[PDB]
Short mmCIF file of C-alpha atoms (C1' of nucleotides) in Angstrom, two decimals:
data_model
loop_
_atom_site.label_atom_id
_atom_site.label_comp_id
_atom_site.label_asym_id
_atom_site.label_seq_id
_atom_site.Cartn_x
_atom_site.Cartn_y
_atom_site.Cartn_z
CA UNK A 1 87.50 179.06 78.82
CA UNK A 2 84.32 180.07 80.65
CA UNK A 3 85.07 183.75 79.79
CA UNK A 4 85.79 182.98 76.08
CA UNK A 5 83.47 179.97 75.32
CA UNK A 6 83.52 180.50 71.50
CA UNK A 7 86.68 178.35 70.87
CA UNK A 8 88.49 175.75 73.07
CA UNK A 9 92.10 176.25 74.21
CA UNK A 10 92.95 172.83 72.64
CA UNK A 11 91.08 169.93 70.96
CA UNK A 12 93.25 166.77 70.94
CA UNK A 13 92.41 163.06 70.56
CA UNK A 14 93.22 160.93 73.63
CA UNK A 15 90.81 157.96 73.34
CA UNK A 16 89.46 155.60 70.68
CA UNK A 17 85.81 155.91 71.85
CA UNK A 18 83.41 157.52 74.39
CA UNK A 19 85.28 159.18 77.30
CA UNK A 20 83.20 158.34 80.41
CA UNK A 21 84.78 160.30 83.24
CA UNK A 22 87.47 162.99 83.59
CA UNK A 23 88.98 164.05 86.95
CA UNK A 24 91.48 166.70 88.19
CA UNK A 25 94.22 165.87 90.73
CA UNK A 26 94.98 169.33 92.15
CA UNK A 27 97.98 169.91 94.46
CA UNK A 28 99.75 172.79 96.22
CA UNK A 29 103.12 171.23 95.09
CA UNK A 30 102.65 169.53 91.65
CA UNK A 31 101.07 170.19 88.24
CA UNK A 32 97.26 169.89 87.84
CA UNK A 33 97.18 166.46 86.16
CA UNK A 34 93.99 165.14 84.59
CA UNK A 35 92.80 161.54 84.38
CA UNK A 36 90.44 160.03 81.83
CA UNK A 37 88.74 156.66 81.24
CA UNK A 38 86.75 155.53 78.21
CA UNK A 39 84.83 152.57 76.74
CA UNK A 40 88.19 151.52 75.16
CA UNK A 41 89.10 150.68 78.79
CA UNK A 42 92.31 152.75 79.06
CA UNK A 43 92.93 154.88 82.14
CA UNK A 44 95.28 157.76 81.16
CA UNK A 45 96.84 160.48 83.37
CA UNK A 46 98.22 163.60 81.57
CA UNK A 47 99.13 167.27 82.06
CA UNK A 48 97.01 169.79 80.04
CA UNK A 49 100.17 171.93 79.35
CA UNK A 50 101.17 169.27 76.73
CA UNK A 51 99.28 165.95 76.39
CA UNK A 52 101.63 164.41 73.79
CA UNK A 53 104.80 164.82 75.94
CA UNK A 54 103.16 163.72 79.26
CA UNK A 55 100.44 161.03 78.62
CA UNK A 56 100.81 158.00 80.96
CA UNK A 57 98.76 154.74 81.41
CA UNK A 58 97.58 153.32 84.77
CA UNK A 59 95.65 150.28 83.39
CA UNK A 60 93.43 148.81 80.71
CA UNK A 61 90.02 147.56 81.94
CA UNK A 62 87.45 145.39 80.20
CA UNK A 63 85.22 147.79 78.23
CA UNK A 64 82.60 148.83 80.82
CA UNK A 65 79.70 151.24 80.32
CA UNK A 66 79.86 152.91 83.75
CA UNK A 67 83.27 153.57 85.42
CA UNK A 68 83.21 155.86 88.50
CA UNK A 69 86.48 157.81 89.06
CA UNK A 70 87.05 160.42 91.83
CA UNK A 71 89.97 162.32 93.42
CA UNK A 72 90.74 161.89 97.17
CA UNK A 73 92.61 165.19 97.82
CA UNK A 74 93.65 164.23 101.40
CA UNK A 75 96.05 161.50 100.09
CA UNK A 76 96.73 162.78 96.50
CA UNK A 77 95.21 159.58 95.05
CA UNK A 78 92.66 158.86 92.38
CA UNK A 79 90.02 156.32 93.45
CA UNK A 80 88.35 154.20 90.75
CA UNK A 81 86.23 151.17 89.93
CA UNK A 82 88.02 148.71 87.64
CA UNK A 83 84.82 148.68 85.50
CA UNK A 84 84.11 145.24 87.00
CA UNK A 85 83.99 144.70 90.78
CA UNK A 86 87.02 146.14 92.65
CA UNK A 87 87.79 149.59 94.10
CA UNK A 88 91.44 150.75 93.59
CA UNK A 89 93.68 153.68 94.46
CA UNK A 90 96.46 155.21 92.27
CA UNK A 91 98.70 158.12 93.34
CA UNK A 92 99.01 160.78 90.60
CA UNK A 93 102.89 160.63 90.67
CA UNK A 94 103.34 156.81 90.83
CA UNK A 95 100.91 155.25 88.33
CA UNK A 96 102.30 151.70 88.86
CA UNK A 97 101.42 151.88 92.62
CA UNK A 98 97.83 150.60 92.18
CA UNK A 99 96.48 149.43 95.57
CA UNK A 100 93.13 147.56 95.65
CA UNK A 101 90.85 148.86 98.48
CA UNK A 102 87.71 146.57 98.43
CA UNK A 103 86.08 143.69 96.45
CA UNK A 104 82.27 143.43 95.79
CA UNK A 105 80.08 140.65 94.25
CA UNK A 106 78.50 143.16 91.77
CA UNK A 107 79.91 146.19 89.90
CA UNK A 108 80.89 149.40 91.76
CA UNK A 109 78.57 152.00 90.20
CA UNK A 110 79.07 155.19 92.26
CA UNK A 111 81.96 156.46 94.46
CA UNK A 112 82.16 159.55 96.72
CA UNK A 113 84.95 161.26 98.66
CA UNK A 114 85.47 164.56 100.55
CA UNK A 115 88.04 167.38 100.90
CA UNK A 116 88.07 167.21 104.77
CA UNK A 117 88.57 163.44 105.38
CA UNK A 118 89.90 160.30 103.57
CA UNK A 119 86.68 158.24 103.99
CA UNK A 120 85.58 156.67 100.69
CA UNK A 121 81.99 155.59 100.04
CA UNK A 122 81.29 153.04 97.31
CA UNK A 123 77.95 151.70 96.07
CA UNK A 124 77.52 148.43 94.16
CA UNK A 125 74.64 147.50 91.84
CA UNK A 126 73.61 144.78 94.38
CA UNK A 127 72.28 147.71 96.53
CA UNK A 128 75.19 147.47 99.04
CA UNK A 129 76.83 150.68 100.34
CA UNK A 130 80.34 150.34 101.84
CA UNK A 131 82.66 152.68 103.77
CA UNK A 132 86.46 152.34 103.98
CA UNK A 133 89.46 154.41 105.04
CA UNK A 134 91.66 154.93 101.96
CA UNK A 135 94.44 156.65 103.99
CA UNK A 136 95.08 153.42 105.97
CA UNK A 137 96.02 151.75 102.61
CA UNK A 138 97.99 154.64 101.01
CA UNK A 139 100.09 155.91 103.98
CA UNK A 140 101.19 152.49 105.44
CA UNK A 141 103.25 149.34 104.65
CA UNK A 142 102.47 146.67 101.99
CA UNK A 143 103.28 143.51 104.04
CA UNK A 144 100.10 142.97 106.14
CA UNK A 145 97.61 144.55 103.67
CA UNK A 146 95.43 141.37 103.51
CA UNK A 147 94.50 141.78 107.24
CA UNK A 148 95.22 145.40 108.43
CA UNK A 149 92.70 147.06 105.99
CA UNK A 150 88.91 146.28 106.24
CA UNK A 151 85.51 147.70 105.12
CA UNK A 152 81.98 148.06 106.59
CA UNK A 153 78.56 147.85 104.90
CA UNK A 154 76.53 150.88 106.09
CA UNK A 155 73.30 149.82 104.32
CA UNK A 156 71.79 147.38 101.82
CA UNK A 157 68.73 147.72 99.61
CA UNK A 158 66.85 144.55 98.59
CA UNK A 159 63.67 143.78 96.63
CA UNK A 160 61.08 140.97 96.22
CA UNK A 161 59.67 140.19 92.74
CA UNK A 162 56.34 139.00 94.30
CA UNK A 163 56.02 141.28 97.41
CA UNK A 164 57.21 144.44 95.48
CA UNK A 165 58.85 146.06 98.59
CA UNK A 166 62.15 147.90 98.90
CA UNK A 167 63.61 146.42 102.07
CA UNK A 168 66.48 148.60 103.45
CA UNK A 169 68.61 146.58 105.87
CA UNK A 170 70.39 148.50 108.64
CA UNK A 171 72.63 145.54 109.64
CA UNK A 172 76.36 146.23 109.56
CA UNK A 173 78.69 143.61 107.91
CA UNK A 174 82.52 143.63 107.91
CA UNK A 175 84.30 142.62 104.66
CA UNK A 176 88.11 142.01 104.93
CA UNK A 177 90.37 142.73 101.92
CA UNK A 178 90.52 139.76 99.49
CA UNK A 179 93.66 140.84 97.49
CA UNK A 180 93.90 137.96 94.92
CA UNK A 181 90.10 138.03 94.28
CA UNK A 182 88.21 137.26 91.04
CA UNK A 183 85.94 139.84 89.36
CA UNK A 184 82.21 138.97 89.81
CA UNK A 185 78.92 140.08 88.18
CA UNK A 186 75.74 138.98 90.10
CA UNK A 187 72.59 140.42 88.37
CA UNK A 188 70.12 142.18 90.78
CA UNK A 189 66.78 144.11 90.79
CA UNK A 190 66.77 147.14 88.46
CA UNK A 191 65.69 149.72 91.05
CA UNK A 192 68.16 148.68 93.80
CA UNK A 193 71.39 149.77 92.04
CA UNK A 194 73.12 152.84 93.62
CA UNK A 195 73.24 155.81 91.15
CA UNK A 196 75.17 158.40 93.22
CA UNK A 197 76.80 158.79 96.68
CA UNK A 198 78.43 161.97 98.15
CA UNK A 199 79.51 163.33 101.53
CA UNK A 200 78.68 166.92 102.48
CA UNK A 201 82.11 168.60 102.70
CA UNK A 202 81.53 171.60 105.05
CA UNK A 203 82.92 171.22 108.62
CA UNK A 204 79.41 171.34 110.18
CA UNK A 205 77.98 168.91 107.58
CA UNK A 206 81.20 166.83 107.13
CA UNK A 207 79.77 163.72 108.90
CA UNK A 208 76.66 163.78 106.64
CA UNK A 209 76.26 161.79 103.42
CA UNK A 210 73.63 161.19 100.77
CA UNK A 211 73.02 158.24 98.44
CA UNK A 212 70.36 157.13 95.93
CA UNK A 213 69.06 153.98 94.34
CA UNK A 214 67.62 154.01 90.80
CA UNK A 215 63.94 153.67 91.79
CA UNK A 216 64.11 157.05 93.62
CA UNK A 217 64.79 156.31 97.32
CA UNK A 218 67.30 159.07 98.14
CA UNK A 219 68.65 158.55 101.70
CA UNK A 220 70.71 160.76 104.07
CA UNK A 221 72.44 160.00 107.38
CA UNK A 222 74.37 162.06 109.92
CA UNK A 223 77.17 159.80 111.25
CA UNK A 224 76.83 160.47 115.03
"C1'" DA B 1 121.62 149.04 130.74
"C1'" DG B 2 120.96 144.78 130.66
"C1'" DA B 3 117.30 140.67 130.02
"C1'" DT B 4 113.14 140.46 127.77
"C1'" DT B 5 110.81 141.58 123.60
"C1'" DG B 6 108.51 143.79 119.21
"C1'" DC B 7 109.17 145.90 114.67
"C1'" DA B 8 110.27 144.74 110.20
"C1'" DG B 9 113.49 143.99 106.95
"C1'" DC B 10 115.88 140.32 104.22
"C1'" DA B 11 115.31 136.04 101.35
"C1'" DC B 12 112.59 131.66 98.75
"C1'" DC B 13 108.90 128.53 98.44
"C1'" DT B 14 104.04 128.74 96.77
"C1'" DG B 15 99.59 129.70 95.69
"C1'" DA B 16 95.67 131.18 92.67
"C1'" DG B 17 93.62 133.86 88.51
"C1'" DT B 18 94.44 133.60 84.10
"C1'" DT B 19 95.92 131.78 80.18
"C1'" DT B 20 97.04 128.48 76.33
"C1'" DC B 21 96.24 124.37 75.06
"C1'" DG B 22 94.85 118.87 73.62
"C1'" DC B 23 91.66 116.23 73.20
"C1'" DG B 24 86.66 114.34 72.70
"C1'" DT B 25 83.09 114.53 70.22
"C1'" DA B 26 80.93 115.65 66.76
"C1'" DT B 27 80.02 118.18 62.62
"C1'" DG B 28 80.17 120.04 57.53
"C1'" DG B 29 83.58 119.48 53.54
"C1'" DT B 30 86.93 117.72 50.35
"C1'" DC B 31 87.12 113.82 46.46
"C1'" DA B 32 87.75 109.18 44.83
"C1'" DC B 33 85.05 104.74 43.14
"C1'" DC B 34 81.93 102.43 41.39
"C1'" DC B 35 77.12 101.70 40.80
"C1'" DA B 36 72.25 102.44 38.17
"C1'" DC B 37 69.80 103.86 34.56
"C1'" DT B 38 69.38 105.08 30.06
"C1'" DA B 39 69.90 104.40 24.72
"C1'" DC B 40 71.70 104.34 19.75
"C1'" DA B 41 72.96 101.03 16.95
"C1'" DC B 42 73.60 95.58 16.50
"C1'" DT B 43 73.69 91.12 16.56
"C1'" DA B 44 71.38 86.46 15.22
"C1'" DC B 45 67.82 83.02 15.39
"C1'" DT B 46 63.48 82.10 14.35
"C1'" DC B 47 59.24 82.46 11.50
"C1'" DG B 48 57.15 83.12 7.33
"C1'" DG B 49 56.15 83.18 2.00
"C1'" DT B 50 57.50 81.02 -2.17
"C1'" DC B 51 59.17 77.65 -4.98
"C1'" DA B 52 60.42 73.08 -6.80
"C1'" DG B 53 60.15 68.18 -6.47
"C1'" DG B 54 57.46 64.07 -7.51
"C1'" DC B 55 54.17 61.13 -5.34
"C1'" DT B 56 49.37 61.39 -5.22
"C1'" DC B 57 44.13 61.45 -6.39
"C1'" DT B 58 40.34 62.01 -9.75
"C1'" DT B 59 38.67 62.64 -14.02
"C1'" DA B 60 35.81 61.08 -18.36
"C1'" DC B 61 36.35 59.41 -21.85
"C1'" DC B 62 35.69 57.71 -28.99
"C1'" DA B 63 31.61 56.93 -32.52
"C1'" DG B 64 26.83 55.77 -30.91
"C1'" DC B 65 22.81 54.86 -28.05
"C1'" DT B 66 19.50 55.93 -24.76
"C1'" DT B 67 18.39 58.03 -20.78
"C1'" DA B 68 17.62 63.12 -19.48
"C1'" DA B 69 16.40 68.69 -20.84
"C1'" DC B 70 16.52 72.58 -23.47
"C1'" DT B 71 17.22 76.06 -27.68
"C1'" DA B 72 16.03 77.89 -31.68
"C1'" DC B 73 11.89 78.90 -35.01
"C1'" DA B 74 7.61 81.65 -33.36
"C1'" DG B 75 3.06 86.53 -31.51
"C1'" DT B 76 0.61 90.90 -28.89
"C1'" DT B 77 1.71 93.53 -25.60
"C1'" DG B 78 4.85 96.38 -22.14
"C1'" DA B 79 6.47 101.27 -20.18
"C1'" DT B 80 11.72 103.69 -20.80
"C1'" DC B 81 12.80 106.63 -23.63
"C1'" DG B 82 13.40 110.79 -26.57
"C1'" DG B 83 12.62 115.65 -26.36
"C1'" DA B 84 9.58 118.60 -25.71
"C1'" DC B 85 5.88 120.32 -22.86
"C1'" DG B 86 4.79 122.95 -18.10
#
DNA sequence: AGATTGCAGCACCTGAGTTTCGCGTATGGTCACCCACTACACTACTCGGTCAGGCTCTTACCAGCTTAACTACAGTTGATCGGACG
């Protein structure tokens, strides 16, 4: 309680080890459920009214030391990296309904989403930044999912061990949804991994986004 | 409002990511056999000293003599010896 910070309202065990990310799935029609992932790999959704009577599991991942999880409030779905190399959506009231959104050759390290639109931004540690419409997956039929949903690479960082440049590539690439795909882990230059990515969420700024690599090359674009 | 057509819902054959598995190939581990080296106590044949046997050589003769030297009697002079000195 930010007004009474001396003692917590509750202190209950929910994971075996380090809890990496916690996220709130707010709604005008359902309880404020909370999701959590940890180095033990479990993804749990629960209601803070009573954890013990409500705790539910979405998945167990391989133990991974950075797992981005965010809430897409336009479609009431959590958006998460599987700790390896796929982006997936899970509705807060149907945990079994896991839909994979995109596959990448290197781990998804940062994810961003906004309160005004369903556009999800995901950055992989290969320096690739991808955009995809999560609502097109969530609000439509299962049958033609392998062809009706696609993604676009907005930018790619690259680096040369001998030339020492950072080499931002503006060229757009379309990646279709490989549903049955393998997890992958291609190692890449230390500075070119994407450390954060977020859209501005005001109406005036709503087409603007910001992203960063780990060397320091913060980058912003207005999508017009 | 019918002839032309799409959506998409049903069912069944199928495909890969993922898993469990069998074997190769090769490696450390069990343990059984029989070998090498060592050694305390022993086996046994020969060599060696001692003794007898008995065959063997070589001596030197009896008294006398007659060829050969000693072996006692015998006289002035040494120089250790006692026993006392320095």
